[PDB]
Design a protein around this nucleic acid. Structure first.
Length: 346
DNA sequence: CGGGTTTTTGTTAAGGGCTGTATCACTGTTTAAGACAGGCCAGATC
């Protein structure tokens, strides 16, 4: 809880609400810039190197057999830390159309602060989930195997009820649970009767056999379910099985950022409480063997700007460090389009 | 097909009164974003 303002280089405008910060061995990489990829950086990815409160967005090449992926804006990013690699699912192509491909980010070659990524296009079969954004995917382990739990987020209307006078309206996807096999890219949808209403922009914490879904926004009624869910999974010799349990003490937040401050101990920072109240309080989530425990922590001191501005975003860098953003006074002495902050958490 | 007639028409040029449209003098008082190529430092490496 040590806030600290940051200064950005020349290509500052690339950072936009919805950016991703992937992480490889303490080396952070910005993804999801604004506008299609330029020619000064053909791929979109960037070394997100912060030193002395100054970050240098540096271009970063791909491999020779990778696949150039568009800059998405609200993907599902899960760290399949098993040959470290990330999984990207869905998002908003700069043409405001949603995507459904899965992308796999590995590192094919590195030499003295010069990385060469490898982004491969994994496609799904079976009960493929809907092209959507705002959702959340997490890799969960069971009985020596792994699987991907994807829980719904909002999307565009289907190709039937999509009129052009409301072409951009969005509906929360049905609250299913998608189990995704990466070894074959196979999807399987399960309708947990305990999950009722649609949910997007939530927070999902995986602990080695479960998924703790928490907070989020429910557009079907414009509320924020303060509940939470524990999706227990188990992988038999044949068809997997899932169960859910509601628990008390759930936060009421959407767009809250997550990072793993300590081993089996997460922090969570402000999303939004009400459409006028940005969330200020920070909450530490003590995981464990079976029992989650959300609690409140030392209310980090927010500067004047952060208490003035009404929207604010960011993501975790990976080592208990949350990078933030603030729009900045429009009617001002040519205030920049975005100011940026960083919060350590030890 | 004529052919005296109408019944209306076509024309001249000076000067003026009027009207409609073209012409005239004139005013702005540097770019911002992105692409590529040197060139020189600056560090990695034999």
């Amino acid at each position: 809880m040590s806030l600290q303002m940051v200064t950005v280089g020349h290509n500052i405008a690339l950072i936009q609400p919805g950016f991703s910060l992937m992480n490889f061995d303490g080396q952070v990489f910005f993804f999801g810039q604004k506008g299609w990829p330029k020619r000064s950086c053909p791929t979109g990815v960037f070394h997100f190197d912060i030193k002395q409160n100054h970050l240098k967005l540096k271009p970063a090449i791909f491999s020779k057999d990778s696949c150039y992926l568009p800059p998405l804006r609200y993907p599902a990013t899960c760290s399949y830390k098993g040959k470290h690699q990330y999984i990207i699912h869905g998002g908003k192509t700069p043409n405001n159309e949603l995507s459904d491909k899965i992308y796999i980010m590995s590192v094919a070659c590195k030499n003295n602060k010069k990385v060469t990524f490898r982004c491969t296009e994994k496609d799904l079969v079976g009960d493929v989930p809907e092209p959507r954004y705002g959702h959340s995917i997490d890799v969960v382990y069971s009985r020596g195997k792994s699987m991907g739990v994807l829980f719904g987020g909002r999307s565009y209307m289907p190709s039937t009820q999509r009129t052009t006078e409301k072409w951009n309206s969005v509906a929360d996807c049905l609250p299913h649970v998608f189990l995704i096999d990466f070894e074959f890219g196979c999807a399987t949808s399960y309708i947990l009767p305990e999950l009722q209403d649609g949910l997007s922009f939530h927070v999902s914490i995986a602990r080695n056999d479960t998924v703790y879904i928490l907070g989020g926004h429910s557009l079907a009624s414009n509320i924020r379910p303060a509940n939470l869910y524990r999706i227990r999974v188990d992988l038999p010799l044949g068809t997997p099985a899932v169960n859910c349990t509601v628990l008390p003490g759930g936060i009421s937040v959407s767009s809250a950022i997550l990072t793993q401050t300590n081993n089996d101990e997460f922090v969570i920072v402000g999303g939004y409480q009400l459409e006028n109240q940005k969330r200020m309080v920070c909450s530490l989530v003590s995981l464990g063997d079976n029992t989650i425990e959300i609690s409140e922590m030392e209310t980090p001191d927010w500067t004047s700007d952060i208490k003035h501005s009404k929207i604010w975003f960011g993501s975790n860098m990976g080592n208990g460090t949350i990078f933030l953003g603030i729009p900045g006074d429009n009617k001002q002495a040519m205030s920049e389009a975005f100011y940026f902050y960083t919060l350590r958490c030890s």
